[PDB]
Design a protein around this ligand. Structure first.
Ligand SMILES: [Ca+2]
Ligand SMILES: [Ca+2]
Length: 480
């Protein structure tokens, strides 16, 4: 019978923005149906004459909906000439198609909880009266309305909009999904916790690309959006569309020092193989700190043992290692001649031998004296920088210190692809000649900001660039 769409798009008040249709209007609902959204959401209020209407604000065109007769509301006209649609009108207009679900939100009553409970009862009756229980899914800010919907319809789709109640208690009261603002979900495992207990996850007021990508990365069930057309574009671009499934990720909502569950510290100031000038500190908030949703690796012009600079070098070794997959890191590079920020991966067990026999992968490398180039490199026993046989590529990146860029690798059995802003600039292939040409079976990611060195220091160190901060939005690793 029905041919439901399978996407995660939920049209917030319909697809009103792009075509300048009125919010919570028939044109907004029909535009969402035309786009192919999973569902269209709308807000219902009850007039003083107990006529259910569709509007978000409590006052429609200067008229309080709950305190005025429905006939008074018809004095007002929307931008496209529409009158405020009744719930029956909205339900009937959506009853004429079978591709897009109907997400119904009962706004909490500004009069009394009893009146709002009556609205909840009136909504269910009209849904049953028009025989559209298969179309309507329910979300609400009032928790009692959610429990009332479940009482009248035991298997109705119900979701909660306030983040106060725990996911475990929502399932206890037999709710079907959580629909919290996307800021609530920025707490380790919250999205995948609720999914573990069988609750669908929905996020609303999501109009920006980085948040949509973050939600799709953690595979949220639905995304309520005011930009449905933009979300569709990002759904095709997201790695989950290519089969990638997220195995490990740190979005850096930690707000403190790097999590001991995810990162270890490389400590020492003995050159680190490239005669580097910095001392990497151990659990020092002056060089590694998570604040405002981004990891901050900070190089400071400060003495540390026998070195004039201190910085940080965080390693995922012995905590998360992987073979193959997609690694995705979004970072804003620190500016200044003499810096050497790096996003790279080293083998955990070094099964083939010491460096460079077991290999090395450099997802992102940047030198401060050349601000137009970002380098991706692989290092092998046969191809490495010591003997000048390494294979790598540079790509000019615009505004690397002012805005975030996503540096990524796609690591397969046969090759490795290097990406900067979904553009593939380097492909390293397995030549099937053995470990010397291709030494890849399991590595671990590393994040560091080096000062000077045999590469970064060739032009000296502008000692005024300090303190220099590398900001990493997140580190995500997908696998097929
Ligand atoms: Ca709404
Ligand atoms: Ca973040």
């Amino acid at each position: 019978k029905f041919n439901w769409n399978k996407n995660q798009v939920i049209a917030h008040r319909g697809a009103w923005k792009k075509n300048n249709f009125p919010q919570n209007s028939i044109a907004s609902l029909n535009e969402a149906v035309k786009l192919g959204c999973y569902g269209s959401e709308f807000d219902v209020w009850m007039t003083a004459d107990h006529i259910l209407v569709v509007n978000h604000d409590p006052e429609f065109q200067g008229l309080t909906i709950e305190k005025v007769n429905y006939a008074d509301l018809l004095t007002k006209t929307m931008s496209n000439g529409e009158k405020i649609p009744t719930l029956e009108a909205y339900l009937l207009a959506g009853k004429k198609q079978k591709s897009t679900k109907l997400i119904l939100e009962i706004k909490p009553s500004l009069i009394s909880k009893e009146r709002g409970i009556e609205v909840t009862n009136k909504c269910v009756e009209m849904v049953q009266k028009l025989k559209v229980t298969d179309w309507v899914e329910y979300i609400s800010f009032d928790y009692d309305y959610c429990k009332r919907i479940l009482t009248l319809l035991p298997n109705a789709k119900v979701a909660y909009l306030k983040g106060e109640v725990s996911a475990e208690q929502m399932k206890a009261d037999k709710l079907t999904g959580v629909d919290y603002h996307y800021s609530v979900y920025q707490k380790d495992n919250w999205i995948e916790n609720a999914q573990k207990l069988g609750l669908t996850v929905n996020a609303w007021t999501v109009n920006a690309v980085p948040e949509m990508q973050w939600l799709l990365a953690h595979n949220v069930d639905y995304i309520t959006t005011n930009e449905p057309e933009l979300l569709f574009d990002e759904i095709k671009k997201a790695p989950v569309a290519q089969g990638w499934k997220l195995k490990w990720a740190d979005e850096f909502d930690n707000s403190g020092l790097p999590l001991n569950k995810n990162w270890g510290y490389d400590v020492g100031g003995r050159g680190w193989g490239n005669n580097e000038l910095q001392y990497y500190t151990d659990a020092d908030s002056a060089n590694a700190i998570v604040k405002k949703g981004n990891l901050n690796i900070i190089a400071l012009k400060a003495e540390k043992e026998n070195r004039h600079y201190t910085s940080a070098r965080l390693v995922t070794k012995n905590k998360f290692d992987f073979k193959y997959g997609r690694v995705e890191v979004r970072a804003m590079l620190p500016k200044g001649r003499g810096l050497w920020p790096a996003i790279w991966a080293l083998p955990t067990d070094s099964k083939y031998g010491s460096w460079p026999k077991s290999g090395e992968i450099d997802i992102m490398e940047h030198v401060g004296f050349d601000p137009d180039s970002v380098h991706g490199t692989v290092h092998t026993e046969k191809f490495n920088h010591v003997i000048h046989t390494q294979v790598g590529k540079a790509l000019k990146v615009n505004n690397p210190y002012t805005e975030y860029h996503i540096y990524a690798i796609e690591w397969f059995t046969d090759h490795i692809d290097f990406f900067i802003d979904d553009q593939k600039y380097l492909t390293f292939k397995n030549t099937q000649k053995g470990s010397g040409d291709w030494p890849f079976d399991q590595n671990f990611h590393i994040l560091n900001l080096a000062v000077g060195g045999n590469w970064g220091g060739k032009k000296g160190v502008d000692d005024a660039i300090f303190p220099a901060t590398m900001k990493v939005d997140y580190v995500r690793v997908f696998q097929k």
